[PDB]
């Protein structure tokens, strides 16, 4: 019960204004015959061109919104819209591209998908609202096959070109022509009443309808997100390491450890509240304070209301001590909070668009994220940049140039030079700050934080 078999029975009302005396009687079998393709009793790893809801979720990276519109059926042309924004007119003879032929359009197909997704994912699964323009356009630039390799290396292929008779993954395309054994899902088939627009906008107040395919494009797959991420969550699922996720994890771990340690060596809270993660542990154990958890588990949805999360009646004295919310994201922090927020408008290949403002982050596991809010943050400061250590100033075991720098608080430095190991530290410690900052982390404190109260703990 791993792939969606062929079997299956296909929903066909929303086919038949576009293909009217469209059966209702319907399988992906004769769907796909339908479609213009042949699948020849072929076990070569392409089952099906269509995917289950738990394959999709598996390959979130790989989702492509995808629509087409009658622009005035081989008779016509079509308006096809990507959820990246692209408008191509095919003619039979935001972006808004003027009419062309399918033999130079499909070539656009293939940059545009191959650009989008080569750092992202192995596949392309185009997420449709199905009403028959866009199944039956699929013909003019998808060629089908058993699953091969990429001429140039060992990914599987994603293209293929009539011009050489071969076939590339995402990163060797250029110049190809046709999508390769491209995946796809009819988010029509999982039980909706009413039009795309207005499930879309039950959930979702960022993406309008300009009524270009590209808008519906965008919709389509921002329902798909909201249905698989937001309203249904599986933390179970593990994503393949694309980019700097371990480093990235380390960064965090390391970060919050220095941020809170200062916060209670600067400031002596009597009390911890840490407040998030039922998993979390200690991120400061040799500290003195009275640490006392809170579960909460990652809001998908809407931000945590502050009221609901402290009252209702604990220590219940939250405004004891220092609030600790690591990803923990809250409508309002309260004043004597340390903050890590992850910033949904941040540009990276872990970071996915969402709905209503939010942001899918994969980083091993999918977190949609609501919307970054700076008025979140005006009880708090951001945090400035500093390296803190009390660790002896012994190198043991690169080379140097000697560090100068007002905020490495260290002995050495209070003695007016800072040694080699401290050097070598701040530097390793402004790196993976400066990763987890890049990634889309943001990190807030107490406006009575002042870092001039470290340098007394070396006495
Ligand atoms: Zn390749
Ligand atoms: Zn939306
Ligand atoms: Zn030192």
């Not at 013909?139 to 590339?168: H, M, N, Q, W």
């Not at 998030?276 to 809407?302: H, L, M, R, T």
């Amino acid at each position: 019960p791993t792939h969606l078999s062929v079997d299956t029975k296909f929903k066909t009302e929303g086919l038949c204004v576009d293909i009217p005396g469209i059966p209702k009687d319907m399988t992906y079998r004769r769907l796909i015959s339908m479609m213009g393709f042949k699948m020849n009793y072929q076990v070569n790893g392409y089952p099906n061109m269509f995917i289950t809801r738990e394959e999709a979720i598996r390959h979130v990276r790989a989702w492509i919104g995808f629509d087409v519109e009658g622009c005035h059926g081989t008779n016509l042309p079509l308006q096809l819209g990507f959820s990246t924004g692209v408008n191509l007119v095919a003619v039979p003879t935001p972006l808004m591209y003027k009419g062309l032929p399918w033999n130079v359009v499909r070539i656009k197909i293939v940059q545009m998908l191959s650009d989008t997704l080569k750092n992202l994912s192995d596949r392309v699964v185009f997420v449709l609202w199905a009403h028959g323009f866009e199944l039956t356009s699929m013909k003019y630039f998808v060629k089908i096959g058993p699953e091969r390799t990429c001429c140039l290396c060992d990914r599987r292929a994603t293209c293929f070109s009539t011009a050489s008779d071969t076939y590339a993954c995402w990163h060797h395309s250029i110049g190809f022509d046709y999508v390769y054994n491209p995946f796809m899902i009819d988010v029509q088939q999982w039980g909706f009443t009413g039009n795309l627009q207005s499930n879309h906008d039950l959930y979702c107040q960022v993406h309008g309808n300009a009524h270009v395919a590209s808008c519906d494009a965008i919709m389509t797959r921002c329902l798909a997100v909201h249905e698989c991420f937001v309203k249904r969550v599986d933390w179970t699922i593990e994503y393949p390491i694309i980019g700097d996720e371990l480093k990235i994890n380390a960064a965090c771990r390391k970060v919050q450890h220095m941020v809170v340690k200062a916060a209670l060596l600067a400031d002596k809270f009597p009390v911890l509240h840490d407040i998030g993660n039922p998993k979390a542990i200690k991120c400061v154990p040799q500290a003195d304070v009275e640490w006392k958890f809170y579960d909460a588990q990652p809001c998908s949805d809407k931000a945590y209301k502050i009221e609901e999360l402290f009252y209702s009646y604990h220590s219940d004295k939250f405004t004891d001590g220092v609030c600790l919310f690591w990803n923990c994201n809250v409508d309002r922090y309260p004043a004597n909070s340390i903050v890590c927020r992850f910033d949904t408008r941040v540009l990276s290949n872990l970071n996915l668009p969402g709905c209503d403002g939010g942001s899918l982050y994969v980083n091993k596991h999918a977190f949609h994220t609501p919307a970054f809010d700076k008025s979140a943050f005006v009880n708090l400061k951001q945090l400035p940049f500093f390296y803190y250590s009390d660790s002896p100033c012994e190198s043991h075991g690169i080379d140097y140039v000697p560090l100068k720098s007002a905020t490495c608080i260290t002995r050495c430095n209070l003695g007016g030079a800072v040694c080699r190991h401290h050097a070598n530290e701040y530097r390793l410690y402004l790196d993976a700050y400066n990763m987890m900052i890049s990634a889309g982390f943001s990190l807030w404190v107490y406006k009575q934080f002042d870092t001039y109260n470290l340098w007394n703990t070396f006495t």
